[PDB]
Structures are given as structure tokens and as C-alpha cells.
Amino acid sequence: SQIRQNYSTEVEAAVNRLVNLYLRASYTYLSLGFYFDRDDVALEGVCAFFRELAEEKREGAERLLKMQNQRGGRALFQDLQKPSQDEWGTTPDAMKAAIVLEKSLNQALLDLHALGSAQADPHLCDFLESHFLDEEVKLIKKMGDHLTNIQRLVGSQAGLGEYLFERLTLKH
Amino acid sequence: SQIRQNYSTEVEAAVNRLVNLYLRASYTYLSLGFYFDRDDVALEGVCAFFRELAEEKREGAERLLKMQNQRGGRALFQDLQKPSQDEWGTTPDAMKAAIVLEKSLNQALLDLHALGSAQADPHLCDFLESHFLDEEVKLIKKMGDHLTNIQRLVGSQAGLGEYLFERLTLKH
Amino acid sequence: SQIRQNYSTEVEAAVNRLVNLYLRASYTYLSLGFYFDRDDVALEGVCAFFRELAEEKREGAERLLKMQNQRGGRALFQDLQKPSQDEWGTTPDAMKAAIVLEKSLNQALLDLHALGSAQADPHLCDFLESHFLDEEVKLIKKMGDHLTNIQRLVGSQAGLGEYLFERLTLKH
Amino acid sequence: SQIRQNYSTEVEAAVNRLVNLYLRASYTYLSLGFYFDRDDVALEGVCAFFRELAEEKREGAERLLKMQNQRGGRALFQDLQKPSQDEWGTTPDAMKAAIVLEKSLNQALLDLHALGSAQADPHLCDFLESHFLDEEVKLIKKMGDHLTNIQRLVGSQAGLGEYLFERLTLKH
Numbered sequence: 089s090q091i092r093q094n095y096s097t098e099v100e101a102a103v104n105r106l107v108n109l110y111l112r113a114s115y116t117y118l119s120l121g122f123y124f125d126r127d128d129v130a131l132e133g134v135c136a137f138f139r140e141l142a143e144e145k146r147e148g149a150e151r152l153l154k155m156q157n158q159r160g161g162r163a164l165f166q167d168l169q170k171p172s173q174d175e176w177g178t179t180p181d182a183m184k185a186a187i188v189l190e191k192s193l194n195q196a197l198l199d200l201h202a203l204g205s206a207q208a209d210p211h212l213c214d215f216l217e218s219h220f221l222d223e224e225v226k227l228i229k230k231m232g233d234h235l236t237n238i239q240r241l242v243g244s245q246a247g248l249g250e251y252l253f254e255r256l257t258l259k260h
Numbered sequence: 261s262q263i264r265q266n267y268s269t270e271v272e273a274a275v276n277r278l279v280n281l282y283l284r285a286s287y288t289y290l291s292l293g294f295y296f297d298r299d300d301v302a303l304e305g306v307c308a309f310f311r312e313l314a315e316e317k318r319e320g321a322e323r324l325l326k327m328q329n330q331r332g333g334r335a336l337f338q339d340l341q342k343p344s345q346d347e348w349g350t351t352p353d354a355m356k357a358a359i360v361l362e363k364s365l366n367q368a369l370l371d372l373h374a375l376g377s378a379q380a381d382p383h384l385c386d387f388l389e390s391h392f393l394d395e396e397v398k399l400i401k402k403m404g405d406h407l408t409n410i411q412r413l414v415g416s417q418a419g420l421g422e423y424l425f426e427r428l429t430l431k432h
Numbered sequence: 433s434q435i436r437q438n439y440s441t442e443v444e445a446a447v448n449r450l451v452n453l454y455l456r457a458s459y460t461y462l463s464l465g466f467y468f469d470r471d472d473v474a475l476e477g478v479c480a481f482f483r484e485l486a487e488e489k490r491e492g493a494e495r496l497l498k499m500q501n502q503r504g505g506r507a508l509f510q511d512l513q514k515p516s517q518d519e520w521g522t523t524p525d526a527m528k529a530a531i532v533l534e535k536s537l538n539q540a541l542l543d544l545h546a547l548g549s550a551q552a553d554p555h556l557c558d559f560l561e562s563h564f565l566d567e568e569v570k571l572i573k574k575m576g577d578h579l580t581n582i583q584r585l586v587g588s589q590a591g592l593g594e595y596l597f598e599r600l601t602l603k604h
Numbered sequence: 605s606q607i608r609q610n611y612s613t614e615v616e617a618a619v620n621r622l623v624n625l626y627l628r629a630s631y632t633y634l635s636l637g638f639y640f641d642r643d644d645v646a647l648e649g650v651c652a653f654f655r656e657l658a659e660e661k662r663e664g665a666e667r668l669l670k671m672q673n674q675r676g677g678r679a680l681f682q683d684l685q686k687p688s689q690d691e692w693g694t695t696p697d698a699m700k701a702a703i704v705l706e707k708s709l710n711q712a713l714l715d716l717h718a719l720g721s722a723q724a725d726p727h728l729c730d731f732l733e734s735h736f737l738d739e740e741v742k743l744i745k746k747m748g749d750h751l752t753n754i755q756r757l758v759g760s761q762a763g764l765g766e767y768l769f770e771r772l773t774l775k776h
């Protein structure tokens with residue numbers, strides 16, 4: 089009331105937690121991007137890749153929040169923890185951290201989906217599938233591809249490999 | 261036969277009942293629209309809003325019927341009950357009636373979805389989600405927004421509020 | 433080294449703190465925007481106003497971070513505190529909170545400027561002036577104008593006033 | 605007289621010295637560019653990079669000279685010392701020399717700025733900031749980025765690294 093229908097308090101809470109996770113991921117990507125722009129790191133294509141991901145994660149959080157309002161739920165925001173590292177190592181280190189991060193979001197989506205199914209909320213299930221689950225699978229595949237490529241490159245002409253990957257994959 | 265597959269008689273019947281509900285809702289909106297065009301009511305933006313909804317509900321019924329034929333089911337039509345009122349009061353009265361009506365359609369969709377799930381008809385589930393459930397949530401949110409706005413306006417310069425809402429929200 | 437010149441550790445730290453403040457302000461505006469989109473609040477022009485400000489504050493933080501890298505400093509991120517409220521009251525309440533927030537950013541800029549001057553960092557001084565100080569003054573004037581208008585409107589036909597301001601100022 | 609106002613003889617002299625430094629830097633870049641075009645060096649992208657910088661430094665000197673005339677001061681030219689080397693080594697050697705050179709110009713700008721501040725010449729301060737200090741910071745960041753990239757590349761497939769950097773960064 090006035091609009092809320094078939095929308096459990098459990099799903100509402102889980103949506104707010106998922107928003108926090110997406111915003112945390114956005115923040116992590118922000119840090120990753122600026123790290124690669126340091127004068128002693130200087131890989132612009134890596135910066136650009138992570139900046140784009142920062143945007144995508146913020147967009148995901150905003151989509152969740154709009155959905156929360158559309159269903160008559162109430163957005164509740166919590167502190168956003170700072171990212172897990174201050175310095176992110178080399179390109180393969182960063183790509184590995186990103187995959188870990190996306191898999192964690194993907195698992196949260198799956199957990200929310202199960203909740204929605206358990207709550208007989210078929211509409212949430214359809215909202216998650218068409219707007220989040222498919223994007224995560226595609227993203228994780230791209231990241232895995234990138235990691236395989238960078239790993240193949242840095243074994244074992246590491247500096248050269250890192251430069252070529254940035255120039256010929258990421259700057260493309 | 262020749263085409264019907266995984267399509268229960270229970271789902272077929274429920275689809276025919278849902279068509280009747282959508283057509284009844286279309287009829288209700290038709291009445292709502294013409295009521296607002298009465299010379300002693302005269303709120304054209306309210307008429308236009310309800311006319312559009314009459315169209316949307318008829319389109320929903322037609323989509324259901326096409327789906328029924330696509331699955332090899334058989335459309336069966338019943339009497340369409342006249343709308344619940346002959347006169348619809350003020351704008352907030354009408355908006356309230358519309359929300360009640362849409363929530364009832366939404367609940368029928370959810371009930372059909374449960375049936376489809378219980379009948380292991382995963383394709384129906386996907387047809388309902390992508391084409392009906394999402395539209396209902398969006399519509400009900402817009403209606404709730406409209407009701408909040410009109411309520412804020414008519415407490416307590418009612419005539420003035422009703423005119424402004426029609427001019428600046430509905431005629432937009 | 434390799435590039436850092438005339439860039440004190442004090443200024444570097446103050447820049448990182450200012451980034452945190454800008455990102456916190458962005459988060460606050462995010463919350464403000466979604467609050468106004470609640471079905472029981474429903475003022476889209478107010479949502480849009482705060483969404484734009486969320487974007488502007490994130491852009492400010494990003495400009496500071498790029499500057500930090502350009503000077504050879506190192507970005508360090510901290511936890512982002514959640515916004516001061518979960519519910520933001522009426523339009524004038526929200527506008528008041530926004531002015532308080534911007535004045536706080538403005539004062540942080542002035543404090544950083546003083547630091548830069550004290551550190552004989554004339555280039556920072558010029559970066560802050562041309563890219564942050566002028567924007568804050570303009571923004572605060574717009575906010576003050578909005579607050580004066582909304583205050584004039586809600587004394588004392590509050591609901592009506594709030595609607596008109598959203599329609600005729602914010603939706604413009 | 606007829607126009608000179610708030611323009612000290614100390615600032616006038618310092619401006620003439622800064623012109624000499626900018627023109628010397630232009631000359632150094634001229635030499636750097638032609639060195640990379642030697643048939644036994646043959647890195648056209650490196651030549652082009654330094655040619656552009658030669659142009660930028662001459663433009664800076666000309667801007668200073670126009671400013672000197674605008675303020676009613678008198679341009680005085682001195683001998684331009686030849687560049688510090690006749691042969692410039694490899695790409696990282698040259699990039700290092702360029703950074704040393706730009707940092708020296710940057711420090712001269714900062715020294716002139718301090719003078720201007722000490723002379724209560726707020727207009728000079730604004731001329732230097734908006735037209736010279738910002739450009740130097742941006743330039744030095746680009747140079748530092750280039751040096752980090754080339755260093756990463758030439759450790760330790762030096763010839764290969766030098767070619768790739770010229771083709772994929774400088775020729776871009």
C-alpha cells in the first residue's frame with residue numbers, strides 16, 4: 089500500500105544488500121582504474137577497462153534501486169567498505185581480483201533468485217534473469233578470456249606481454 | 261494435435277478467464293474515460309489517460325488470445341460484466357479504482373504463473389513474465405505516483421488541485 | 433620521482449580526504465534522488481535534480497583523483513559513510529540538507545586552498561579555483577534560489593506548493 | 605608609461621630569462637627529433653614526438669614575449685646555449701633527458717610565480733597558472749607515463765621493446 093504486492097520483507101532486505109554489493113564493486117573498479125593511471129604503472133587501456141566496469145556496476149545498483157521503488161519497497165543504504173587493496177599489482181593480478189569480485193556478485197544474484205523463487209515472486213525472478221544474470225555470465229566470460237590471454241603473454245616476458253595486451257586488446 | 265504440446269486444459273481455462281478479466285478491465289477504462297469527458301466533469305487529460313489504459317488492456321487480451329492459438333488451445337469467450345460504477349467521482353476516486361483493478365489483474369497473472377509452474381509449463385512462465393508481469397508492475401507504480409500526487413493536491417484545495425493535476429501531469 | 437614536484441604529503445592527504453567527501457556527497461544525492469521516486473513521495477523533478485547532483489559530485493571526485501595522479505601522488509580510498517538520513521522529508525527539508533552538504537564541500541575546498549597556498553603550491557590553487565570553487569558558488573546560489581522559491585510556495589499551501597515547484601521549476 | 609602598471613623590473617628580467625629557457629628547451633627538442641631520424645637510429649615516432657615538443661616550447665616562449673609587450677615590458681634576448689648532448693642514446697635515455705628538462709622549466713615557472721606573488725602582481729600569477737603551470741603538469745605526466753612504458757619494454761628485450769613502443773604508442 090499503496091502499490092506493494094507479492095513483495096516480501098526478505099526480498100526487500102536482500103535487494104538492499106545487493107545494492108550495497110554492486111556499489112562496493114563499483115568503488116573497487118574506481119580504485120582499480122586510477123591505480124593503472126599512476127605514473128609508475130601507466131597502462132591507460134587497463135584504466136579504461138576498469139572505469140567502464142565501475143560505470144556498469146553503478147548502473148546495476150541504480151537498476152536494482154529503481155526496481156525496489158517500482159515494487160513499493162524502501163531503499164536503505166549502508167556504509168560502503170573501501171576496496172580490498174590500495175595497490176593492485178600487475179594486469180593479471182587485477183584481472184584475477186575482478187573475476188573474484190564478479191563471481192561474488194553472480195553468487196549474490198543466484199542467492200536472491202533462490203529467495204525470490206522460495207517467496208513465489210516470479211516477477212523478481214524474471215527481472216534478475218533478463219537484466220543481471222545474463223550480463224554477469226557474459227562479463228565473467230570476457231574476464232576469463234582476458235586472464236587467459238594475459239597469462240599466456242606474461243609467461244615469461246612479463247613487461248613486454250603486459251604492454252602488448254594493453255595496446256592490442258584493451259586499447260582496441 | 262496437430263500442434264498442442266505440454267499445454268494443460270487447466271492452463272487453457274485459466275488463460276480464457278484471464279482474457280475475460282483483461283477485456284473487463286478494458287471496458288472499465290472505457291467507462292472511466294467517457295465519464296471524465298462529461299460536460300459537468302470536463303477533465304480531458306483524465307479521459308485521455310483512461311482511454312490509453314482501455315487500449316492497453318485490450319492489447320493484453322489480444323496477446324493472450326494469440327498465445328492461446330499459438331499453443332493449440334481454444335479461445336472461449338464469456339459475457340463481459342459491465343463496470344462496477346456508472347459514475348466515478350473525482351480524479352483520486354478514479355485513480356483508486358484503477359489501482360484496485362490493476363492489482364486484481366496482477367494477482368490473476370501471479371495465479372496463472374503459479375498454475376503454469378505447477379503444470380511444468382516453463383514457456384508460459386516466460387511468456388507471462390516478459391509480456392505481462394513487468395508491464396503491470398510499471399503501470400501500478402505510475403498509478404501509485406499519480407494517486408500520491410493527486411492526494412497531495414486535493415488536500416485541501418480540491419477543485420484547484422484537480423485542474424492543476426490534469427493540466428500539468430496528465431496533459432503533459 | 434619519476435614526476436612528483438612541489439607536491440607535499442600534506443596536500444596529497446588532503447586531496448584524498450576531499451575525494452572521500454565528494455564521493456560521500458554523491459552517495460547522499462543518490463539516496464535523496466531515490467527517496468523522491470518512492471511511490472508515496474512521487475516527485476520526479478526532485479529525483480532528477482538530485483540524480484544530476486550525484487553525477488556532478490562523482491565527476492568532481494574523479495577530477496581530483498586524475499589530478500592526484502597527474503601530480504605523482506597516490507590515491508587512497510577509505511570507507512564511504514552512509515548518508516545522514518534514510519528519509520528526507522519534504523522538498524524544503526531536502527534542499528536545506530543539500531545546501532548544508534555543499535557548504536561543507538565548499539569549506540573543505542577553501543581549507544585545501546589555504547593548505548596549497550601555505551605549501552607554496554600555486555598550481556593546485558589554480559586547479560581548485562578554475563575547476564571547483566566557481567562551480568560550488570554557482571551551485572549553492574541555485575540551491576539557495578530553489579529554497580527561497582519552495583519556502584515561498586509551501587507557506588502555507590504545502591502540498592500544492594510542492595507540486596507546483598516540481599512541475600514548473602524542476603521539470604523545466 | 606604609456607601603459608606599464610604594477611610590473612616590476614624584477615619580473616620583467618625573470619620573464620626574459622624564462623623566454624631564454626623555453627627557447628633553449630625548444631632547441632634541445634629540435635636536436636632530439638633529428639637525432640631519432642638518423643639512418644642508424646630510425647625511430648620516426650620518436651622524431652615526431654620531439655618535433656611537437658620543440659613547437660610547444662617555442663609557442664610558450666612566444667606567449668611569454670607577447671605578455672611582456674602587453675604589460676609594457678621590453679623583450680631582451682640572450683645567446684641560446686646549444687643542447688647538452690649531440691647524441692641522445694636510446695628512447696629511455698631521451699625520455700629521461702626530456703623529463704629533466706621539463707622539470708627545470710616547471711621549477712623556473714614556480715620561481716617566477718613566487719616572484720610575482722612577492723611583487724603583488726596577481727595578474728602575472730593568473731597568466732602563469734592558466735597558460736603554463738597546467739600544461740607543464742600534464743606534459744610531465746605524459747612523459748613519466750612514456751618512460752614507465754619504455755622501461756617496462758626494454759627490460760630486457762631492448763631492441764624489440766624500442767620498436768614496439770615507437771609503433772604502438774608514439775606512432776598512434
Ligand SMILES: [Pd+2]
Nearest residue numbers: 089090091160
Ligand atoms: Pd506504498
Ligand SMILES: [Pd+2]
Nearest residue numbers: 121122125135
Ligand atoms: Pd585513469
Ligand SMILES: [Pd+2]
Nearest residue numbers: 125132135136
Ligand atoms: Pd586513465
Ligand SMILES: [Pd+2]
Nearest residue numbers: 132135136139
Ligand atoms: Pd582511463
Ligand SMILES: [Pd+2]
Nearest residue numbers: 155158215397
Ligand atoms: Pd520488477
Ligand SMILES: [Pd+2]
Nearest residue numbers: 204205210213
Ligand atoms: Pd523462478
Ligand SMILES: [Pd+2]
Nearest residue numbers: 201213214217
Ligand atoms: Pd528466474
Ligand SMILES: [Pd+2]
Nearest residue numbers: 255259260776
Ligand atoms: Pd587506439
Ligand SMILES: [Pd+2]
Nearest residue numbers: 261262263332
Ligand atoms: Pd490442433
Ligand SMILES: [Pd+2]
Nearest residue numbers: 293294297307
Ligand atoms: Pd473523452
Ligand SMILES: [Pd+2]
Nearest residue numbers: 297304307308
Ligand atoms: Pd476526451
Ligand SMILES: [Pd+2]
Nearest residue numbers: 304307308311
Ligand atoms: Pd479523451
Ligand SMILES: [Pd+2]
Nearest residue numbers: 327330383387
Ligand atoms: Pd507462448
Ligand SMILES: [Pd+2]
Nearest residue numbers: 376377382385
Ligand atoms: Pd516458472
Ligand SMILES: [Pd+2]
Nearest residue numbers: 210385386389
Ligand atoms: Pd516464470
Ligand SMILES: [Pd+2]
Nearest residue numbers: 427430431432
Ligand atoms: Pd498541452
